[PDB]
Amino acid sequence: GLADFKPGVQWEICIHHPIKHDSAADLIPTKAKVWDIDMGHAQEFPNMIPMLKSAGKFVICYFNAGALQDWDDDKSKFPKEVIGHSLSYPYDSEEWYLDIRDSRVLELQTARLDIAAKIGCDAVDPDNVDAWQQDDEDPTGFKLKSSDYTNYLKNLAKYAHSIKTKDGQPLLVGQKNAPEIAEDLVSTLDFAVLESCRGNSDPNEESWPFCEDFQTYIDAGKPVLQIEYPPSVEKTGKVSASDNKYYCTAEDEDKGFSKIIKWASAQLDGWGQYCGEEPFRTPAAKY
């Protein structure tokens, strides 16, 4: 339902493992109408998106727009010159920021958009578009400006908005975080996916709240898909009473967002919780 794809829509995100999809009954939680899944997992399990579509779901395909990963099928096509610092620089890792000004990166990323369109995705959720140099600290090594990310996302959107999905409509493109450029992108992009817009319940964490910067998407009739990671979950397996107050108590700044509680940014698995409800778990497919 593209009709359903509007502010307030219920959703689930599960990118750490493939979702189970033998039947519609596997698609826990059943009230989620929007499903954000890893584009690779959808290719590895070819009946996944068909199953989602048969159950009436709108499908968002996650991919990594701003960083290259050691396991990417297309990794060998990226020149060394566009590969920057490890996401744990100075330590080597399996993930490295890309020079998203570069035409070669754009070409490779648009080929991924072609795949998203071919396999049945209604939309894409492009990651890591927030790594410009800030306060004399440079995440990528390329000394990127916030406007470089605005331009890149506009280029991704221009491409996606020129190709059709399997349901016969333009491919949609989300904004992932990057609150500073929401006002510059809201006309172009189709929705937002946020992590920790409410900040952090540990006030000593550097985590300035930014939910208010995405009200402009709600104003445009575009959903804001809001992920919160209460610290207590990763530590204890449960949302503490104090974390429930911090993340779930009604506030103007995230009014109208589609809020979900998840385990950790590095563990966006099937576990989840809606405010005012017990947790659920989307089951995993087996390799």
Coordinates of C-alpha atoms in Angstrom, one line a residue:
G1 CA 0.0 0.0 0.0
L2 CA 1.6 3.2 -1.3
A3 CA -1.7 4.6 -0.1
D4 CA -0.7 3.7 3.5
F5 CA 2.8 5.3 3.0
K6 CA 2.1 8.5 5.0
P7 CA 2.7 10.0 8.5
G8 CA 1.7 7.6 11.3
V9 CA 2.0 4.4 9.4
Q10 CA 3.1 1.3 11.5
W11 CA 6.5 -0.3 10.5
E12 CA 9.2 -2.8 11.3
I13 CA 12.9 -2.7 10.5
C14 CA 15.0 -5.9 10.5
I15 CA 18.4 -5.6 8.7
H16 CA 20.7 -7.6 10.9
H17 CA 19.2 -11.0 9.8
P18 CA 16.8 -12.0 7.0
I19 CA 13.1 -12.1 8.1
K20 CA 11.3 -15.4 8.1
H21 CA 8.8 -15.5 5.2
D22 CA 7.3 -19.0 4.7
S23 CA 3.9 -17.5 5.2
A24 CA 2.1 -14.2 6.1
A25 CA 1.9 -15.5 9.8
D26 CA 5.8 -15.1 10.0
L27 CA 5.5 -11.3 9.4
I28 CA 5.4 -10.5 13.1
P29 CA 4.4 -7.8 14.1
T30 CA 1.3 -8.2 11.8
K31 CA 0.3 -4.6 12.4
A32 CA 3.5 -3.3 10.6
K33 CA 2.5 -2.2 7.1
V34 CA 5.9 -0.9 6.2
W35 CA 8.9 -3.3 6.3
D36 CA 12.5 -2.1 6.0
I37 CA 14.7 -5.0 5.1
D38 CA 18.3 -5.5 3.9
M39 CA 18.4 -5.4 0.0
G40 CA 21.0 -8.2 0.0
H41 CA 18.8 -10.4 2.2
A42 CA 15.9 -9.9 -0.2
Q43 CA 18.1 -11.1 -3.0
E44 CA 19.5 -14.1 -1.0
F45 CA 15.9 -15.2 -0.2
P46 CA 14.0 -14.6 -3.5
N47 CA 10.5 -15.2 -2.1
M48 CA 10.9 -12.6 0.7
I49 CA 9.6 -9.5 -1.2
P50 CA 6.9 -11.6 -3.0
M51 CA 5.7 -12.8 0.4
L52 CA 5.7 -9.2 1.8
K53 CA 3.8 -7.9 -1.2
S54 CA 1.3 -10.8 -1.0
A55 CA 0.5 -9.7 2.6
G56 CA 0.0 -6.1 1.5
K57 CA 3.2 -4.6 2.8
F58 CA 5.2 -1.6 1.5
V59 CA 8.8 -2.6 1.2
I60 CA 11.8 -0.4 1.9
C61 CA 15.3 -1.8 0.9
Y62 CA 18.2 -0.8 3.1
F63 CA 21.6 -0.3 1.6
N64 CA 24.8 1.5 2.6
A65 CA 25.1 4.7 0.4
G66 CA 27.9 6.5 2.3
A67 CA 30.1 3.5 3.2
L68 CA 31.6 0.4 1.5
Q69 CA 31.5 -2.9 3.3
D70 CA 34.0 -5.8 3.1
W71 CA 31.2 -8.3 2.1
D72 CA 29.6 -6.1 -0.7
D73 CA 29.1 -8.1 -3.9
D74 CA 30.4 -5.0 -5.9
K75 CA 33.3 -4.1 -3.5
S76 CA 36.0 -4.9 -6.1
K77 CA 34.5 -2.3 -8.5
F78 CA 35.2 0.7 -6.1
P79 CA 38.6 2.4 -6.7
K80 CA 40.9 2.8 -3.7
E81 CA 40.8 6.5 -4.3
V82 CA 37.1 6.8 -3.3
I83 CA 37.5 4.6 -0.1
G84 CA 38.3 6.7 3.0
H85 CA 38.6 6.1 6.7
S86 CA 37.4 3.0 8.5
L87 CA 34.2 3.6 10.5
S88 CA 36.5 2.8 13.5
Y89 CA 39.6 4.8 12.2
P90 CA 42.4 4.5 13.1
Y91 CA 41.6 0.8 13.3
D92 CA 41.0 -1.2 10.1
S93 CA 37.5 -2.7 10.0
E94 CA 35.0 -4.1 7.5
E95 CA 33.4 -0.7 6.7
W96 CA 34.9 2.4 5.1
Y97 CA 33.4 5.8 4.2
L98 CA 33.1 6.7 0.5
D99 CA 33.9 9.9 -1.3
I100 CA 30.3 10.6 -2.2
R101 CA 31.3 13.6 -4.4
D102 CA 32.9 11.2 -6.9
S103 CA 31.1 10.3 -10.2
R104 CA 32.3 6.7 -9.9
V105 CA 30.6 6.2 -6.6
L106 CA 27.4 7.7 -7.9
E107 CA 27.5 5.2 -10.9
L108 CA 28.0 2.2 -8.7
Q109 CA 25.3 3.4 -6.2
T110 CA 22.8 3.9 -9.0
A111 CA 23.4 0.3 -10.2
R112 CA 22.3 -0.7 -6.7
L113 CA 19.1 1.4 -7.1
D114 CA 18.5 -0.6 -10.4
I115 CA 18.6 -3.8 -8.3
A116 CA 16.2 -2.4 -5.7
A117 CA 13.7 -1.5 -8.5
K118 CA 14.1 -4.9 -10.2
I119 CA 13.6 -7.0 -7.1
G120 CA 10.4 -5.4 -5.9
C121 CA 11.5 -2.7 -3.4
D122 CA 9.1 0.2 -3.2
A123 CA 11.7 2.5 -1.7
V124 CA 15.3 2.6 -0.5
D125 CA 16.8 3.6 2.9
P126 CA 20.4 4.8 2.1
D127 CA 22.8 4.7 5.1
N128 CA 25.7 6.8 6.2
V129 CA 24.9 10.2 4.5
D130 CA 26.0 12.3 7.6
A131 CA 29.8 12.1 7.7
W132 CA 30.8 15.6 6.7
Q133 CA 33.7 17.3 8.6
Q134 CA 32.3 18.9 11.8
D135 CA 34.2 21.0 14.3
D136 CA 37.7 20.2 12.8
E137 CA 37.0 16.4 13.1
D138 CA 36.8 14.6 9.7
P139 CA 35.1 11.1 9.7
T140 CA 35.9 10.2 6.0
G141 CA 39.2 11.8 5.3
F142 CA 37.8 13.6 2.3
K143 CA 36.9 16.8 4.2
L144 CA 33.3 16.7 2.9
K145 CA 30.8 19.5 3.5
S146 CA 27.2 18.9 4.5
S147 CA 26.2 20.3 1.1
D148 CA 28.1 17.4 -0.5
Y149 CA 25.7 15.0 1.1
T150 CA 22.7 17.1 0.1
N151 CA 24.0 17.0 -3.5
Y152 CA 24.7 13.3 -3.4
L153 CA 21.2 12.5 -2.0
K154 CA 19.7 14.7 -4.7
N155 CA 21.6 12.7 -7.3
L156 CA 20.4 9.4 -5.9
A157 CA 16.8 10.7 -5.7
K158 CA 16.9 12.1 -9.3
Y159 CA 18.0 8.6 -10.5
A160 CA 15.4 6.7 -8.3
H161 CA 12.6 9.1 -9.4
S162 CA 13.3 8.2 -13.0
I163 CA 12.8 4.4 -12.7
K164 CA 9.8 2.4 -11.9
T165 CA 9.2 -0.3 -9.2
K166 CA 7.6 -3.7 -9.8
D167 CA 4.3 -2.1 -8.6
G168 CA 4.7 0.4 -11.5
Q169 CA 5.5 3.6 -9.5
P170 CA 8.7 5.7 -9.1
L171 CA 11.3 4.3 -6.6
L172 CA 11.2 6.3 -3.4
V173 CA 14.3 7.5 -1.4
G174 CA 14.6 8.2 2.3
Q175 CA 16.8 10.5 4.4
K176 CA 18.8 8.7 7.0
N177 CA 19.6 11.0 10.0
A178 CA 21.6 14.1 9.0
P179 CA 19.2 16.6 10.7
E180 CA 21.3 19.6 9.6
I181 CA 20.2 19.0 5.9
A182 CA 16.6 18.0 6.4
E183 CA 15.3 21.4 5.4
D184 CA 17.5 21.2 2.3
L185 CA 16.2 17.7 1.3
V186 CA 12.5 17.5 2.4
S187 CA 11.2 18.7 -1.1
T188 CA 13.4 16.1 -2.8
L189 CA 13.3 12.9 -0.6
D190 CA 10.2 10.9 0.2
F191 CA 10.5 10.0 3.9
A192 CA 13.0 9.9 6.8
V193 CA 14.5 7.2 8.9
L194 CA 15.9 8.4 12.2
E195 CA 18.1 6.9 15.0
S196 CA 18.1 8.4 18.4
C197 CA 16.4 11.7 17.5
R198 CA 15.4 11.8 21.2
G199 CA 19.1 11.8 22.1
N200 CA 20.3 9.6 24.9
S201 CA 18.9 9.0 28.4
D202 CA 22.5 9.1 29.7
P203 CA 23.0 12.9 29.6
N204 CA 26.8 12.5 29.5
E205 CA 26.5 10.9 26.0
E206 CA 27.1 13.5 23.2
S207 CA 23.7 13.1 21.7
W208 CA 21.8 16.3 21.0
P209 CA 18.1 15.7 20.3
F210 CA 16.9 16.4 16.8
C211 CA 13.4 15.1 16.3
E212 CA 12.1 18.6 15.8
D213 CA 14.2 18.9 12.6
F214 CA 12.1 16.3 10.9
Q215 CA 8.6 17.9 11.6
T216 CA 9.1 19.4 8.1
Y217 CA 8.7 15.9 6.6
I218 CA 5.4 15.4 8.5
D219 CA 4.3 18.8 7.1
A220 CA 5.0 17.5 3.6
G221 CA 2.9 14.4 4.1
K222 CA 6.0 12.2 4.3
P223 CA 6.5 9.5 7.0
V224 CA 9.2 9.8 9.7
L225 CA 10.3 6.3 10.6
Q226 CA 11.8 6.8 14.1
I227 CA 14.2 4.3 15.8
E228 CA 15.1 4.6 19.4
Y229 CA 17.7 2.4 21.2
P230 CA 17.1 2.6 25.0
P231 CA 20.6 1.8 26.5
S232 CA 19.0 -0.6 29.0
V233 CA 18.0 -3.0 26.2
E234 CA 21.5 -3.8 25.0
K235 CA 22.7 -4.1 28.6
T236 CA 19.8 -6.0 30.2
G237 CA 17.6 -7.3 27.4
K238 CA 14.6 -5.1 28.6
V239 CA 13.6 -1.4 28.5
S240 CA 14.0 0.0 32.0
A241 CA 11.2 2.1 33.5
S242 CA 13.3 5.2 33.3
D243 CA 14.1 4.5 29.6
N244 CA 10.5 4.0 28.8
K245 CA 9.7 7.4 30.3
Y246 CA 12.6 9.0 28.3
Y247 CA 11.8 7.5 24.9
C248 CA 8.0 6.9 25.0
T249 CA 6.4 9.8 27.0
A250 CA 4.5 12.0 24.5
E251 CA 6.5 15.1 23.4
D252 CA 5.8 17.7 20.6
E253 CA 9.1 17.2 18.9
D254 CA 8.4 13.7 17.6
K255 CA 4.6 14.0 17.4
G256 CA 3.4 12.2 14.3
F257 CA 6.5 10.1 13.8
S258 CA 6.3 6.3 13.5
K259 CA 8.3 5.3 16.6
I260 CA 9.8 1.8 17.2
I261 CA 12.2 0.6 20.0
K262 CA 15.0 -1.6 18.8
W263 CA 18.0 -3.4 20.4
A264 CA 21.1 -1.5 19.2
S265 CA 22.2 0.3 16.0
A266 CA 24.7 -2.6 15.4
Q267 CA 21.9 -5.2 16.1
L268 CA 18.8 -4.1 14.2
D269 CA 17.4 -7.7 14.5
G270 CA 13.8 -8.9 14.8
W271 CA 13.4 -7.8 18.5
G272 CA 11.3 -4.7 18.8
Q273 CA 8.8 -2.8 20.9
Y274 CA 6.1 -0.2 20.4
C275 CA 5.4 2.3 23.1
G276 CA 2.6 1.1 25.4
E277 CA 3.1 -2.6 24.4
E278 CA 5.1 -5.6 25.3
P279 CA 8.0 -6.5 23.0
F280 CA 7.8 -8.7 19.9
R281 CA 10.3 -10.6 17.8
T282 CA 10.3 -10.9 14.0
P283 CA 11.6 -14.5 13.4
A284 CA 14.7 -15.1 11.3
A285 CA 15.0 -17.1 8.1
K286 CA 17.5 -19.9 8.2
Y287 CA 20.5 -20.1 5.8

